[PDB]
Ligand binder design. Sequence first.
Ligand code: A1AZ0
Ligand code: A1AZ0
Ligand code: 9IM
Ligand code: 9IM
Lengths: 311, 306, 306, 311, 306
Amino acid sequence: SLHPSIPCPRGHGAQKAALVLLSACLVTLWGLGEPPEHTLRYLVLHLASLQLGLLLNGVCSLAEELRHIHSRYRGSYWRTVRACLGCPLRRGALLLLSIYFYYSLPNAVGPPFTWMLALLGLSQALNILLGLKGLAPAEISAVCEKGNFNVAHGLAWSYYIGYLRLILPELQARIRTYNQHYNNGAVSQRLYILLPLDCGVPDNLSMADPNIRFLDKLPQRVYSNSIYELLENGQRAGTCVLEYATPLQTLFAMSQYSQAGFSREDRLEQAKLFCRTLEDILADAPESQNNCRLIAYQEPFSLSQEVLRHL
Amino acid sequence: SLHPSIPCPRGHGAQKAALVLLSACLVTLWGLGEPPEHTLRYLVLHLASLQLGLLLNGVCSLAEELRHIHSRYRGSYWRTVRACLGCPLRRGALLLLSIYFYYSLPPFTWMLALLGLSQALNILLGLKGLAPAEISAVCEKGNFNVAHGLAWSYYIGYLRLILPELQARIRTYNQHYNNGAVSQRLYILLPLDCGVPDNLSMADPNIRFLDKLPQRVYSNSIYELLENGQRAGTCVLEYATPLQTLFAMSQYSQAGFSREDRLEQAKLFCRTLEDILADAPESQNNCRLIAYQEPFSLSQEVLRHL
Amino acid sequence: SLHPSIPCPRGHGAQKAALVLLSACLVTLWGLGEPPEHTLRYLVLHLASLQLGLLLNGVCSLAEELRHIHSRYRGSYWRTVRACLGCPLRRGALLLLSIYFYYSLPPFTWMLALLGLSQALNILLGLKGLAPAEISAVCEKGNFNVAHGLAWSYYIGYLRLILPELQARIRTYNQHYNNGAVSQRLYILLPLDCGVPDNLSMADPNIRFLDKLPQRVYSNSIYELLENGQRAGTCVLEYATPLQTLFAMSQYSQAGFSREDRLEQAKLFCRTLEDILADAPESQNNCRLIAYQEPFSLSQEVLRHL
Amino acid sequence: SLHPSIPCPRGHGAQKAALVLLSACLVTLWGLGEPPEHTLRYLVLHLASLQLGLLLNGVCSLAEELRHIHSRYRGSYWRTVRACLGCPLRRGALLLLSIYFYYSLPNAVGPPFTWMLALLGLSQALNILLGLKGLAPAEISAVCEKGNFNVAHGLAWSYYIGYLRLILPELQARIRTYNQHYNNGAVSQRLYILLPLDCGVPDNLSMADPNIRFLDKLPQRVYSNSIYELLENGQRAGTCVLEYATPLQTLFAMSQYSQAGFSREDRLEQAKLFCRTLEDILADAPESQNNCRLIAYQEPFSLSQEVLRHL
Amino acid sequence: SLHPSIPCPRGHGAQKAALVLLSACLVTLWGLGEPPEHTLRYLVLHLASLQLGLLLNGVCSLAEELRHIHSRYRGSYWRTVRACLGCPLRRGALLLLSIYFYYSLPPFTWMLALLGLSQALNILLGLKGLAPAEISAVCEKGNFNVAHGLAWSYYIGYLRLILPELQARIRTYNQHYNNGAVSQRLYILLPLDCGVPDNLSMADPNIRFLDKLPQRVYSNSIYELLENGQRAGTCVLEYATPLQTLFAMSQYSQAGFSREDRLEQAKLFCRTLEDILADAPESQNNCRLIAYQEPFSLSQEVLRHL
Ligand SMILES: CCn1nc(C)cc1C(=O)Nc1nc2cc(C(N)=O)cc(OC)c2n1C/C=C/Cn1c(NC(=O)c2cc(C)nn2CC)nc2cc(C(N)=O)cc(OCCCN3CCOCC3)c21
Ligand SMILES: CCn1nc(C)cc1C(=O)Nc1nc2cc(C(N)=O)cc(OC)c2n1C/C=C/Cn1c(NC(=O)c2cc(C)nn2CC)nc2cc(C(N)=O)cc(OCCCN3CCOCC3)c21
Ligand SMILES: CC1(C)C(=O)N(Cc2c(F)cccc2Cl)c2cc(C(=O)NCc3c(F)cc(F)cc3F)ccc21
Ligand SMILES: CC1(C)C(=O)N(Cc2c(F)cccc2Cl)c2cc(C(=O)NCc3c(F)cc(F)cc3F)ccc21
């Protein structure tokens, strides 16, 4: 909600679509009136074949993982087996069910047991070699945003743990001291962290818009926060402690280099994700309680207008 | 390499396994000896079913992304369809070819309904789950890991700004004071357990603080290294704060960052910091990384690198 | 009564629902008018199958606790069997009667093997899930809560030691001072959001710190109760520290305790603390519990109870 | 590990036994060689009946949870439905599967759809009213321990957050200062916390055993901690900051009161669980960086011997 | 956008031309409707002949690089074979498959000898020469250009080191100058004709040299911009010395750098310099590129950008 261009967390729309598709398929099956015994047997055989294919792919992965057991898996074999096949005992039970219900049940549509196993191994080898069973970017994004497999996650958490959680307490006291000592307008008691989505972070904040102009270094493990006054049609509508977000600058510098594999599309994606994650952390932090305000913006507009409307 | 516990980049053992499995499958198919027209039809049907399942999964993902199209994909349907279904042209051609072969190769709509029901059950319950090893491999290949971002930010923000002047400051200190020669390399420690005391001396009594390097300010601390009570050497010891941040991430509940994930990302962070510092112009053998896993004397490990 | 958003203890709505379901079942069996012998035979068979499934689940539980027998049950097999199978004599008699009826009522070993397989599948995959509402009801009934312990500790540890002396010290401060006299009741605030600032001024500027009560010392404070900028009274304001403890528990990842559970336990803590203080011999209406949920004027809410 | 009587966390042995039983059942089925389609159909129908019974139980639970919607569920029906029927879409899909399979598949042993529904409703009503489906205490304890549904966990976390986390940092400095002043042996730099499993906590630690005697009050929120010395055959072999665990005292007081429903067997179980939870928290917490040691004991034995052996 | 004569990056017009050609071929095949077996056999034979010709060309290339194996490829035969034969596995499989079709489809040795002779004549006389358009496309695809190196060196050596301090020096001179403030940007001139005078006075009398910026001895210059004989502003004009380097390169005979190539590389240099400066962190709109070619008024062109 910081900016309309920042994505929201993934919902359960896929589950709802799956439920609707299941209902439609059930309605079609009831309408056609085909025998249900064949339907159940074929569905069980299909699921058994899928489980056996997953087993074969997991074994193929285990073949390479066995050389990583000493380093990535603390020298334990059951850990590697679980990482290759998911839950060990549940998958084993599913495999036993597959074996029992394929070696016994009739197979009108499907190969015989050992011939089916050979053909399925051939198909799995073809999938591994040619990469047919790949992951579309939607699934990769969902996995990344579910298990927190990102770089924006790391950058935002580092920003909170290292810088914000350290200056948020003393910020109010220092602002109050500056207001009391110097009787020359008023200063808002919240640091406004700017979040340029396009990751364009100049070293000089005043160059973003001439209205934002530096006024004074806020008096004081040595944090220097330059305060800026906001000119509205040439008149100072107020002043505030304003600064950029350095993780966005590090994201941009990551995109510049060639040892990152981090392109402009990925840079913008991570900028949006970092802004959202920092919003979450600051919303649910004890230090950030009417203390700091995030101002996310994408240049298509003047910065002073948004800073003032948030003021 | 950096440490025996640090996982080396993934090898091609999966390709060797695929080759072995392909050889075994060819051997057994030749042994059984059945006409290949039936095999071809069955395999084409299998790929057709797999492609139809992928299409249904993409349809569900499209229904999910209908509410994120305007923000994630700049409000363009082409990007959303490509994200949910892979490459548009390639996947579309593959699905069309599979459908044509499926219709040509000898119930017609009943099979489609059964396949749709099976895919809906797979998506809802989650039978075809992604194994943790596959997820880790994909994330590492695509640089979708937290440690990569943390290490790159560490290099860009702190290392790149102090390494050029570290040698100059060390030389100034050496020409300003003597015995006691400080090493010209920043010995960055990488404790894989991620338990970092706020002071080196607290972590190990064999390590003593000596002085502070001359200096935004960048204060560095030169430490005394002890052995049997005698000073063996002095180096600019400095913990890698990204590991402390990983530990704090694992502490909080909002991160969803488990201890096993913490150790794995510590290993990845050390490895990618090695990779970054290997080719970094600012790194000219003036910064040596030390990785140690307590099952230990830290001072002995530091000296072994001297 | 304490707050509209605090859940009252569960009544017997499930009993009414069961009665309605039983009445509907009687109505529908009367409507069909099926012979009762077959109905009874099938009901007994279903109950025997459920008993056998419970027996197999208890066998699996006993296999699990065979290694815990030394600690959980002090090396006693009888207690282990009772824990894994409920009442020993009653469950044993019920299982024996069910087996006898199943043998008498008209495959036998095939059905037993299939029932064992079904129970193994239920235990492995986890089809027989537990409803979260049922889990919450069981926890509330059997005191398997966290807020229960939190509130009992807060009452026993702190309230029980200050409530007798709070009125005496309030009176001492009243006679020491002059005319609005401080209220002789403790207005313990209970912010259900669990976000407690260290100072009341930060929570609400209209509330101001005024003085400290005279004294193993409890430094209870006396605050200015400003309405429209004028002091309408004086009393002792004191946050509930178990709320801060629950907040810190929700913050950490080593608690298995989420924000939804945090609000749930704040509700339960307020409810059971009020229940304890209602019957507390030390409490003689000398401490008034004030609770609120932020959607708010704190000073006006406090003045309402004044 | 602290004491042989403290129960270890539940392992996956239950699933191991389940897999063993499944293998035995599969072997038995293969030996009998009954028509596999009959077995699969019967299993599907049994699972459908179980799902329908769970649906009826969830509906009955909702019938009482709906009156708590305004307070316990923040006034939302979706929350109540989710809390009564588990995951909404997954449970709905399972229910639709059960309905479709029962309405279509033949059943040699099984009532017709409406008559089966009536009989299952009667059985569910009987189970609810009479409590026939009695939850054995072992599974109740397993669920409570898995989901942190025990007062011991809350008391341990409160003990850590309120008291230990505020004194453990400065404890080392205070002990070092006291050692600097009074050179009259040396005091251990680790706080020892006594855990009486019998929940018998006297007000004075000295009266617990003659060999333990209070020496001096450690100089400093008043965190006055009394140091105690150990009389090994009349000699002060060691001295340390020793005190009881007040959560165990509160547990004993709870057991004394009749308004807690907190019996003696439950008191012992909760004492053990509190000890183990505090062990875990101190093991992983940063403040307890080899700063505190827990001495858990149960009187069937001298306390001083255990304290010395831990020293 | 920098200049009308600056070429845009190569598009995909050839893809559209191929689409039109394919459409015409499909239309004529549908119109004629000749049997497809002969068409397939002829096309397969033609493709196999093309593959065999490429194989023979690669064999000759390998015979050439048998002496460069130890210099260009560090003494590894596999890299040399890949260089002379494209992707090893893909092209090897293509050649094997083409051979398999060629043998399967029905003299044979005479055809192979004739194909070898045709390849020998193609290589010796260079019939399959690379048109300059294809060479330019490959160079712009793989970034094989003199302009690329020149612009990258200009950015990394000069612009990246003077863009930051230029604005500070300009601000100092602005709060040092009594009388029109100088612009805060570097107005780099990019004369596409590459005829650069040693001074701006010779370029146009309407532009006057005024002063030297305070100072690495970069020592930029500030000029007077005369409009109608009166000063309209002052900017830090500064030629692009890589253009002079390109001109001097074209002058000499050892460069192999004709005037056409000189103009092409000047245009490419300007385009890639703009591309680099667009994403350059040091560029904060403090350096405005100016390009101009006489079919001209330099002073008016500079005033337009103000
Ligand atoms: C960013 C690189 N990085 N990635 C990861 C992962 C870890 C690190 C890392 O190690 N950084 C770091 N370590 C230092 C140690 C010393 C020293 N003397 O030892 C000196 C340094 O440079 C001053 C140090 N720096 C760089 C600057 C750091 C701290 N800092 C930040 N941080 C971030 O923005 C940020 C981005 C991301 C992502 N995560 N974070 C949080 C860390 N913003 C600041 C704004 C102001 C201002 N407005 O004035 C002043 C600051 O510094 C004053 C505090 C100095 N204290 C710091 C700790 O205690 C000793 C010295 C600010
Ligand atoms: C809270 C953590 N925790 N969870 C469980 C379970 C057990 C404990 C625990 O161990 N607590 C504890 N033990 C101590 C021992 C010493 C010592 N020197 O030995 C010193 C301490 O700190 C001063 C001790 N503390 C913390 C302070 C505690 C008592 N106290 C509380 N109570 C709670 O908040 C609370 C929350 C929940 C839930 N349950 N409770 C009841 C305990 N509110 C207070 C408000 C004031 C004020 N502003 O006026 C002053 C207080 O105490 C001043 C000194 C009184 N003391 C002196 C020593 O004897 C005991 C009494 C207050
Ligand atoms: C839903 C439905 C009816 C369906 O559409 N298919 C696709 C399909 C084929 F794959 C193959 C042939 C026909 C159809 Cl029609 C399917 C498959 C099975 C099954 O058991 N496949 C086992 C199996 C193979 F068939 C080939 C193989 F190489 C390995 C393997 F392990 C069950 C039900 C279905
Ligand atoms: C696994 C297997 C073979 C099994 O062991 N039983 C136990 C059992 C009975 F319950 C009932 C009779 C015999 C057996 Cl033998 C079972 C039941 C069904 C079934 O459909 N039960 C519907 C159903 C009822 F019959 C009575 C009722 F009150 C509600 C109800 F919902 C399917 C498969 C099995």
